[PDB]
Curated annotation (Swiss-Prot):
Protein name (database record): Phosphatidylinositol 3-kinase regulatory subunit alpha
Annotated domain remarks: The SH3 domain mediates the binding to CBLB, and to HIV-1 Nef.
Expression (tissue specificity): Isoform 2 is expressed in skeletal muscle and brain, and at lower levels in kidney and cardiac muscle. Isoform 2 and isoform 4 are present in skeletal muscle (at protein level).
Top-level taxon in the UniProt lineage: Eukaryota
Disease: Agammaglobulinemia 7, autosomal recessive: A primary immunodeficiency characterized by profoundly low or absent serum antibodies and low or absent circulating B-cells due to an early block of B-cell development. Affected individuals develop severe infections in the first years of life. SHORT syndrome: A rare, multisystem disease characterized by short stature, anomalies of the anterior chamber of the eye, characteristic facial features such as triangular facies, lack of facial fat, and hypoplastic nasal alae with overhanging columella, partial lipodystrophy, hernias, hyperextensibility, and delayed dentition. The clinical phenotype can include insulin resistance, nephrocalcinosis, and hearing deficits. Developmental milestones and cognition are normal.
Organism lineage: Eukaryota, Metazoa, Chordata, Craniata, Vertebrata
Assigned protein family: Belongs to the PI3K p85 subunit family.
Subunit structure: Heterodimer of a regulatory subunit PIK3R1 and a p110 catalytic subunit (PIK3CA, PIK3CB or PIK3CD). Interacts (via SH2 domains) with CCDC88A/GIV (tyrosine-phosphorylated form); the interaction enables recruitment of PIK3R1 to the EGFR receptor, enhancing PI3K activity and cell migration. Interacts (via SH2 domain) with CSF1R (tyrosine phosphorylated). Interacts with PIK3R2; the interaction is dissociated in an insulin-dependent manner. (Microbial infection) Interacts with HIV-1 Nef to activate the Nef associated p21-activated kinase (PAK). This interaction depends on the C-terminus of both proteins and leads to increased production of HIV.
Coiled-coil regions listed in the entry: none
Gene symbol of the encoding locus: PIK3R1
Function: Binds to activated (phosphorylated) protein-Tyr kinases, through its SH2 domain, and acts as an adapter, mediating the association of the p110 catalytic unit to the plasma membrane. Necessary for the insulin-stimulated increase in glucose uptake and glycogen synthesis in insulin-sensitive tissues. Plays an important role in signaling in response to FGFR1, FGFR2, FGFR3, FGFR4, KITLG/SCF, KIT, PDGFRA and PDGFRB. Likewise, plays a role in ITGB2 signaling.
Residue stretches making up the SH3 domain: 1-76
Part of the full-length chain shown: 4 to 80 of 724
Post-translational modification: Polyubiquitinated in T-cells by CBLB; which does not promote proteasomal degradation but impairs association with CD28 and CD3Z upon T-cell activation.
Length: 77
């Protein structure tokens, strides 16, 4: 069970490793990604506290990095 987020705003990628977010897009992030960043204390539910995340854009079908301040925690699956 990875964590799911939803875009609040459009983000245009910068680095080669980023991805584009469009308003409404749904993304999943693997739990291991957050663990290996030292994120116990439940930051997963407050992504703006994380800075950058890495996951899969369920909507566009791409993978890469994206700002935590652009998304909204919607649960898990």
């Amino acid at each position: 069970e990875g964590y799911q987020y939803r875009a609040l705003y459009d983000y245009k990628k910068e680095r080669e490793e980023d991805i584009d977010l469009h308003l409404g897009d749904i993304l999943t992030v693997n739990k291991g990604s957050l663990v290996a960043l030292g994120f116990s204390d439940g930051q997963e539910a407050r992504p703006e506290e994380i800075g950058w995340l890495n996951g899969y854009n369920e909507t566009t079908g791409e993978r890469g990095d994206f700002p935590g301040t652009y998304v909204e925690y919607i649960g898990r699956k």
